[PDB]
Each structure stands twice: as structure tokens, then as C-alpha cells.
Paper text:
The G2SG-OMe thio-analogue bound weakly to native and WT recombinant HvExoI with the respective Ki of 2 ×10−3 M and 4 ×10−3 M, reflecting its ability to attach at the +1 and +2 subsites instead of the −1 and +1 subsites, which was most likely due to the rigidity of this thio-ligand. On the other hand, in W286F the electron density map of G2SG-OMe was defined at the −1 and +1 subsites, where this thio-ligand formed H-bonds with Asp95, Lys206, His207, Arg158, Tyr253, Asp285, Arg291, and Glu491, and stacking interactions with W286F and Trp434, whereas G2SG-OMe did not bind to W286A and W286Y.
Author numbering: -3 to 602
Amino acid sequence: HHAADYVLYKDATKPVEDRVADLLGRMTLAEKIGQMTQIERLVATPDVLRDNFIGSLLSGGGSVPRKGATAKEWQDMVDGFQKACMSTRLGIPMIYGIDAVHGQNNVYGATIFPHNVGLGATRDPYLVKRIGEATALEVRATGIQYAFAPCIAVCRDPRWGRCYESYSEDRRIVQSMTELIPGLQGDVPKDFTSGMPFVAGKNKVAACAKHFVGDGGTVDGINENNTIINREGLMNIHMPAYKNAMDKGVSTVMISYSSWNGVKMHANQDLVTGYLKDTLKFKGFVISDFEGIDRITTPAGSDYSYSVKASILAGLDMIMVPNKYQQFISILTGHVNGGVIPMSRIDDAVTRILRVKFTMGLFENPYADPAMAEQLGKQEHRDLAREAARKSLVLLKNGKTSTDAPLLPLPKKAPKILVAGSHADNLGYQCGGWTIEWQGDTGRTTVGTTILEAVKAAVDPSTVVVFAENPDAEFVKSGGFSYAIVAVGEHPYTETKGDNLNLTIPEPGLSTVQAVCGGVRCATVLISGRPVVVQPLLAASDALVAAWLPGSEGQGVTDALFGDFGFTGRLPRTWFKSVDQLPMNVGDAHYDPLFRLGYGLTTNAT
Ligand SMILES: CO[C@@H]1O[C@H](CO)[C@@H](O)[C@H](O)[C@H]1S[C@@H]1O[C@H](CO)[C@@H](O)[C@H](O)[C@H]1O
Ligand SMILES: *[C@@H]1O[C@H](CO)[C@@H](O)[C@H](O)[C@H]1NC(C)=O
Ligand SMILES: *[C@@H]1O[C@H](CO)[C@@H](O)[C@H](O)[C@H]1NC(C)=O
Ligand SMILES: *[C@@H]1O[C@H](CO)[C@@H](O)[C@H](O)[C@H]1NC(C)=O
């Protein structure tokens, strides 16, 4: 269809399947295996991308061009990499992926949304789709096309360091939150075939249902460990949200580090090929986790040859190498050349990677759009996040006896009030993990509003606000305070650093709460990624709020504390009495919760 140098794969009016086949039929083995290779930006250069025909780049946690980098600096990095890839013989654009898992969270000045567990508390799948929408805009502002989200793990033991990344222990709630997908990607059209990949265009991003499958079901919530459960439990708890993901056209699926009844997920041909591909009819691409194939073996990386064979034969399409790309490429090339991996397996992986790239419009818009840069940290999106933070809060207690005046909502006018605790004026702590750094961080790491700042912004001008991080009891008693807001809880963590067998918040926490509440009527805001031991915190407090990891917009906290909106959130998990009860989930036989799933007190706007 027209000029004499016409190449069908480059014709944007042809059907995606036609473009895929046309390109595929021209590629060498080296160009094919290059598509299946994703590398970290830290090892990428123009010659490496060009000479190995690389298919994808990512930024892992905290992998950034520099600290404080603008949206424009991100776009230029990405475009730099893309220009190298476009200069190959076939000019196959790369796709760049990142963990935008509560906003575009590696990026300075990006809106940071509440983490998933909070989002579960809102029971509001439309809110979540809207967060999808806004997140895609902030991701594209940085020139990125691909977000490794949502995590649709069903966390079954809060001792897991990734429990905050799961919407709920109830798979019904996780299923309903897969609306993040069409938020990120766009609504699939009228007559869409379930399992097809979809992205609407250059203002949307490819998504990633992760981590397939049973990541949330591991023994004692040990991260990357074994999930021991029969097929029926696997299918009825851990799988259903992947099917909803198929119906919404999720573009990619990332495989889990975890194992199911002893089999590494990265080596499981039955689940990856037999079930995801052949039974759910997934036509997008399947990507490893970060050195996921290495960890097939014990020790990890001790037989990389096997790692490659097993993972690729299992059915994985793209490998998040992400550093030793030369070895990965050499090994896979060697296995194809020796007939150990058939060309049909290679052609299938490449067919899928290209399908996603063509379908999302990457060949037509390989480069970043500088007018999208101003979407980073947009106030409209912060106002959404603030809404989400407010809706996520669960009021556990609001008065020490059923006869006391309720403490919340608090009046904005009072001569003098106290704000206290390690989490009252600490942005990093209120964002938690996967914020600027991989593990999150402490203090003022990005743009936002801490609890203290939000209080100051909310109160009557005549109200005197005093901050003290960890005051003693005499300070409180002597201070002439009308009430106190005290914020404490967990430090930021991510993956295995967060695995925790005791779930007790660090000190000082409880002792500040005791000191403060012993001198004045107090509202304790508890910041955590999960239920933690809370009886002592309850005994001391007039009111206690479980605010999860609410993100950059701390005004969502005060919106509820001061009565602009009523508390409506409900526990998306069971709150245990004791860690020895664990695992303990709603529907279990000796369900003995401190607070059951669904619990939450309410208030009315004032
Ligand atoms: C930087 O991402 C993380 O980096 C640390 C730094 O050492 C690695 O050891 C971690 O295992 C990865 S975790 C893994 O990364 C994916 C991409 O970052 C992510 O989508 C996935 O959910 C994680 O399990
Ligand atoms: C589970 O964790 C232990 C360390 O506690 C490790 O030795 C074992 O290999 C892990 N199993 C799996 C399947 O990851
Ligand atoms: C609880 O467990 C974590 C390990 O994840 C540890 O850092 C902390 O010191 C422990 N606290 C108590 C009270 O045992
Ligand atoms: C808010 O409205 C509910 C429903 O009628 C009511 O039960 C609750 O006690 C009210 N609280 C107020 C006005 O403080």
C-alpha cells in the first residue's frame, strides 16, 4: 500500500496482527532474542541498546537519572534510549517500564497516592480507576509507557512485607479494584476479546497484573517463599483477579518469585503456558520479575543456563534480566542454536511483545510528549489523592467509654492544640515504601503535606498549633492544650525488609501516645502498611484512626479529623488480637478478630 520502499510493519493503518507477522518474518535470531531482553537503565548505553537489539528498559526502585530530576530530565533520558533503539536496522522502539504503584512514585514532585491496602478500605473501585487515570498521566509526563501495576496479590498473612501492596485479604475486593487497569490503559472497546492486550494510546500506559500467582499466600507471609494450597484454593483465592484482568485487557503479566506447592512460578509451564496462555487466552506478554529466573535455583544464579531454559520453556516472553544482558543473550542464543529451545517458543514470545508494542501505539509515538510534562504533581491529581486518603481512613475508636463525648470530629477553633509523634511531620513515613527510593525514606523526600502542615492549613487562624515530636507527660499537662493529634506507626519498608514476625510498631510510638493521651484528650493516627498490635494504643487513646500509608496528601487525614467529611472507610483486612493467631482470615473456622473485616466506625460531616 504505496511507495516503492513500503514496509508493511511500519504502516499505521494496517491491523496489529498483520504488522506483527510482517515484522516477525524479517527479524534475525539476534533481533528476536533482543526483543525478549529488558535491561536496567543503569547498564544501558546507546551502543548496548543498538548492538543487542534490546526490547525494553526499566527503572527499578530508586533508579533515576538523578535526585530531584524534573519531568523533562526523565523524558530526555527515555528519548535518549529510544533514539538508540530507533536507529537499529528495523527501528523497533523499546518500551520503558517502571513501578508506578501509588502514583509515579520514583519521581520527585509526583503525586503519591495511598497504597493499596488503604485503597481497599475505600471500597470504591471508581476512585481507583480515577487514580489509574491520573497515574498514567504522571507516568507519561516523564516519558514512560509502562507501569508495573496493579499488584493483585491477595495478602493472606500481614507478616508479609508486601501486604500493603494488596487491596485486601478478600479476593472479591481485589477483583473489584482491577479497575485500576482501564484507568491506566483506557477502557477496552465494546466487543473486546478477554485476554487481548489493550492500551488506548499515547496518553495511557501499559499495565501489569502481578505477581502471578499466589504471591500473597506464602508460608508465614515470608516473601518470595512457598505457597502451600491445593488447586481449588489457588483458583478460588489467588487467581480470580487475573481473570478480571484478562477481561479488562491487561497488557502484561509479571510472574512471582514465589512457588506453588514447591514449584518455582518462574519455571511453571502448567500455570504460565497451560493456564494463563492456553486457558485464560492471555495474548499480551509475560515478563519475569527482577532476577526472577536467577532465583529458580538455590543458590540463586548458580546455574544461569538452566534458569534461562526453564523460564523460557515455562512460557515467559520477556526477561527482566536486568543487568547481565550479555550472558542472558549468549545463553539463550546458544540454547536455540543447539535445539534445546525451539524457534516456535522464541517466535511466540516476540509475537506477544510486538503485539503489545503495536497495539499501544508505540511504533507511532515512540518519543515523549513535552506538553505532558506539566501533568507531574498536578493539583487536580493531588485533590484526588487527598480524597482517596480521606476515604481510606478507618476509625477504630471514637471515645473511651460508650458514655464519653465523641472526640472526632475535632473543632478547628481552640486556643491551643498539640500535634505530636514521629509520624506527624514526616512525609516519607506517611508515604511508606516505593516512594523516591525502593524502601521509601524519611523526612521531606518529595512535594506534599505532612499531618502537621495539614493541621496548620485546616485550623482557625486564632488556633495556636504546637508541634512536639516526642514530648513528655509534664509538657502535655502543662501546655494548656485543648486536645492532641498524635501520629505514630511503622517505618517505610518494601519486599523482604518488611517481613515481620512480631508486627509491633517501633518505639517511641506507644510511649509518646501514652504520654500525650495521659495529659490531654487525644486522637491517635496510626500509620502502617497492615494491622499491627494495637491494644495498648487503643487503651491509651480517646480516638484512633487507621490511616494506612496515605501518601503525599496529608490533608486527607485532617479532612476527616476536623469534620469536613465523615469517616467511611472499612477494614479491608482482619485485625488480629495476637500474631500467634496468624494466619487468620475472614471465613476461617476459629475466626477470633480484634476487629473483623468490614469493621469501621463513622461520623457525620460538621
Ligand atoms: C529496584 O527494584 C528492586 O530492586 C532491588 C534492588 O536490589 C532488587 O533486589 C529487587 O528484588 C527489585 S524487586 C521487584 O522489582 C520489579 C521492578 O522493580 C517490581 O515490579 C516487582 O514487583 C518487585 O518484586
Ligand atoms: C523459604 O524460606 C527459607 C528460609 O526461611 C528457604 O530456605 C527456603 O528455600 C524458601 N523456600 C522457597 C520455596 O522459597
Ligand atoms: C520485630 O520484628 C522486626 C523484624 O522484622 C524487628 O526489627 C523488631 O526489632 C522486632 N520487635 C520486637 C518487639 O521483637
Ligand atoms: C450521623 O448520622 C447517623 C445516621 O442517622 C447517626 O446515627 C449518627 O449518630 C449521626 N451523628 C451525628 C449527627 O453526630
